[PDB]
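Q: Could you predict the 3D structure of Beta-phosphoglucomutase?
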Amino acid sequence: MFKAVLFDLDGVITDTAEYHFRAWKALAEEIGINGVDRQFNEQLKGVSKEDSLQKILDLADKKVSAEEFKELAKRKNDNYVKMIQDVSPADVYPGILQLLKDLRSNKIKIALASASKNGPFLLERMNLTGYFDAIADPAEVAASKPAPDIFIAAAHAVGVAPSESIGLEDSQAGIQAIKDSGALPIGVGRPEDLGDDIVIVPDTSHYTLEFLKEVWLQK
Ligand SMILES: O=P(O)(O)OC[C@H]1O[C@@H](O)[C@H](O)[C@@H](O)[C@@H]1O
Ligand SMILES: [Mg+2]
Ligand code: NA
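A: Sure. Here are the predicted structure tokens for Beta-phosphoglucomutase:
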């Protein structure tokens, strides 16, 4: 049986992937880049703030100064941080609170493997911090998603091997990171976005301890 679950935050715990998308699209349009639509945004999910901005600039083969790059990233963050102030426990996705409770009752470790530096603040907004045994700090990894480092760190932070862990993700980059960590991925979203080669559930209500067991027994 698995000994840890490694949670992505945005698009897994709550609908903040939507807010990252809206904030990045707004930023892109301010600088005359109009290609950040929902399809393109699948390439941005799970990706760090700086890598996200660079992918957007690349889309237009646009170059900005180092000073402008810093300011643009800060502008997007300031906007996103204002968007999330009213997040509350009511915004926790279906099934997630119960899963956290059931994992703890079964002595299964819980770790956060979010790329977001705003992750701790969001867990506090949602009254979830006390469920987490560890938060892997994305500022401390040498390499960001789709590199596996954040998932490896999360597992190690709770004293469990990645190979004894499940990772929950909504993103292409994050699914790849889980795969390369050695943990077992279960995605949430559309196979057209996340692939047909791992277990994918259509919504977070499917993330029951019963189902994670159903999946683990068959890997
Ligand atoms: O700018 P932050 O809060 O550090 O977030 C970094 C990344 O966090 C990830 O969780 C999101 O999927 C990305 O969309 C986001 O860019
Ligand atoms: Mg995500
Ligand atoms: Na406009």
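Q: Anything worth pointing out?
A: The CA atoms of residues 74 and 106 lie 41 Å apart.
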